[PDB]
Amino acid sequence: NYMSNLPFGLGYGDVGKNHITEFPSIPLPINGPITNKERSLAVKYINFGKTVKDGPFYTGSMTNDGIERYSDKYLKKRKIGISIDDHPYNLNLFPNELYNVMGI
């Protein structure tokens, strides 16, 4: 009857209900409090990952209306842009195919 089977260490009360937590329960000792050394390490990690993103090599992006008045005039420009052309590239390190996009 497929319900006749039963192991020794198991009673009928324990079996008959499938319950898998699916949430983790055994942590790792690495999630204790912080240390001053790790704090300063995090600070320098924050400065990194930020300096590169604000740097030239971004390639990240994957109301600029047409009406013209004096507000557009003398408007403080938000940023001074940068391009791939600006940074000095050592030509040997790069293949010939990519020379067009960089400013020769």
Partner: protein
Amino acid sequence: LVTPEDVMTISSLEQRTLNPDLFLYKELVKAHLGERAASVIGMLVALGRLSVRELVEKIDGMDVDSVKTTLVSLTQLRCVKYLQETAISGKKTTYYYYNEEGIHILLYSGLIIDEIITQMRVNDEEEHKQLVAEIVQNVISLGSLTVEDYLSSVTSDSMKYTISSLFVQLCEMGYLIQISKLHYTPIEDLWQFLYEKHYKNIPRNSPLSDLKKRSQAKMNAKTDFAKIINKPNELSQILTVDPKTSLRIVKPTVSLTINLDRFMKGRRSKQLINLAKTRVGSVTAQVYKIALRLTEQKSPKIRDPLTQTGLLQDLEEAKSFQDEAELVEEKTPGLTFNAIDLARHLPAELDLRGSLLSRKPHSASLINSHLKILASSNFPFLNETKPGVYYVPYSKLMPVLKSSVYEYVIASTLGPSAMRLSRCIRDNKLVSEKIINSTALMKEKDIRSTLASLIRYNSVEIQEVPRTADRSASRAVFLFRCKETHSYNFMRQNLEWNMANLLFKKEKLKQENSTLLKKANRDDVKGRENELLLPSELNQLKMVNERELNVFARLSRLLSLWEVFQMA
């Protein structure tokens, strides 16, 4: 109860499917470069070697220009390799790879800066710290750099020596090398190029046999490979030049990059010190701290001599690599050292006076005692060539470091009963359950529970033995093994996945809370956000920054955890 809809939001079952390698690399490049770089890197990792037209055909972005810009950025950060090959039938098609060692600089950046700050011993002078920090930060954030570029990136009429004398000091310690085409060239492809041109210039129908010809090509290309590999790693001719009436100054034209191998060797030294601190006294390990730092500069390569990645291992002759590893690790004249050498570089704070009890001023007879202690320890911390001569046997110390870190991770996560059972089954071979009970002295029910909790990971293998022609599970007797390679393989993937998960969570938090970072950028976030009132906004900023710092700390600890398994 929790409904399946609530599961997909709270629990990370959506991310439990992603491949650990693709997840971590993609998250890293998305954090540091962006969405196009992540797209290209993900495509390279998922499919392998590709060309630009294939990249355009694969990624939704069909703008060759976008692909070319992404590839130049990824090359400047040397997260990619290239191999421009020519077909005999006609034109030449270049190809692109993903650089494991390039991404690991982003994965290790804070640790790299930490090591360069601490090893220069500039704790005395404040401005020296800022100078080396800025040098290393700019180098890592720019990919490659020149002394001319750095000197023109400073105000003129200043003391260029102050910002250039340490640069040569950086180059002299191995924390800075020049960059060449071998860094952007696949190692196995280079070995394939070198193996030929030695199997081709062989005389036609030579007296040497085909097996003899192949062996001749192997050992005649190994020498060229070794020369080309060792050239950029240790050739100080760039820093050896000296313009007239000047100090030792590096060549302006050469472009410098970070040397990941030196940092990896430093990390291995740190792991060895931290593991040694758990079997001997702090005084004994204090000497070990300076013994490892002295041989660090000339220490052998850590992950591989680049020769396992280069080819098929061998028919059976990885012994020709093991023997060479032993030969180098011993017969290196720098690596061999005596108890006299350690006297000079000994810390001033250390006393060594009462640390020793015999029968139960930095004197050389004190050092020899502790070095004999190190040699006597069960872990081969040191080995003696001749009485008075000393060296570190990496070929025998790395397996014990790996096994100890592994068993202590097991102890910290699963039960101490699990650690005892794992060590019991590992020390024994093919141990049955009755024998486990005999030589472990623990109740069989508990032993079975822990064995099951251990098989969920690749830690305990089952060896079936059938007694009938049809391998029934009723008539078979079940054994157990440990299979150290499978267990280390599983452990590194788990840690890699968890680092990927933490970085993804941090990016998600920043995505949700950028609405305050916008105002922070508006009002000069550093120190002024209090003046903008909005105490709720300040508290939200506070807890999100706390979460970020905790994420970075746990990431660094995970790095120290998976380092030893990343070794070989």
